[PDB]
């Protein structure tokens with residue numbers, strides 16, 4: 001109604017995003033449908049997070065449509081030219097370090113808005129990252145986003161896509177907050193440099209092994225509460241010592257920033273606010289203007 005679906009874009013979870021026109025090309029997504037009808041809770045949770053997350057580095061919501069006896073719910077949003085995963089598969093040469101810093105600064109600023117507003121996204125991935133022709137980066141999907149409070153409690157155990165899933169979720173952590181989001185940001189950082197996924201594990205066991213092979217095998221000394229972890233209680237993985245795959249590509253401060261991103265201990269994991277304060281973004285390859293981004 002009121003929109004002509006030009007072409008469906010992609011399917012995520014039970015939600016699907018189309019491309020329509022107003023008079024102006026728009027982006028339209030229908031939220032996940034629920035069997036129980038007695039207003040959908042999952043639809044409301046997605047609506048709440050995306051509204052509170054309204055930010056220049058977040059997708060612009062034009063309208064939200066409900067009706068049909070509350071069976072169908074739609075969210076009208078401004079159409080973005082590209083999604084980041086598409087560029088990775090359709091670029092001849094890797095992103096410049098200045099462009100990477102600009103995208104990371106855009107990403108980190110948007111992440112800080114969510115956490116300051118008690119918002120957890122938990123589904124940070126390249127295909128969920130939208131890049132405009134003008135260099136503006138926005139976050140697209142909120143199908144996993146959820147609110148959290150100061151007194152922490154148990155939430156959704158299995159969250160985040162396996163490739164970007166935090167190790168604590170890979171080890172079945174009962175409580176998690178803001179640590180998984182920063183882990184995904186670190187995973188996206190490595191992908192940008194190499195145009196390839198950082199940890200493309202085939203399964204949860206493979207995902208844990210891939211992380212441990214390069215980042216080493218964590219322990220109680222480097223991670224308090226490792227013994228109490230439900231997975232580590234009845235399991236013991238192979239000890240992998242030491243590995244940098246970005247030789248002569250990432251600066252010394254770049255490695256330090258990445259190490260803080262991919263920190264095994266959630267407490268020692270760098271926050272979004274401290275990420276922007278790292279000297280890597282203030283190094284010799286200064287970030288490039290968003291308006292100066294090359295052609296797509």
Ligand SMILES: Cc1cc(O)c(-c2ccc([C@@H](C)CN(C)C)cc2)c2c1[nH]c(=O)c1sccc12
Pocket residue numbers: 009010011012013015016017027028029059077078079080081082083127128129130140141143
């Ligand atoms: C050019 C372009 C490509 C895309 O892959 C997506 C997009 C479509 C689905 C999702 C989620 C459900 C799930 N994805 C993992 C499949 C995320 C992004 C989008 C896009 N352009 C847009 O304007 C918008 S608005 C919301 C989305 C988009």
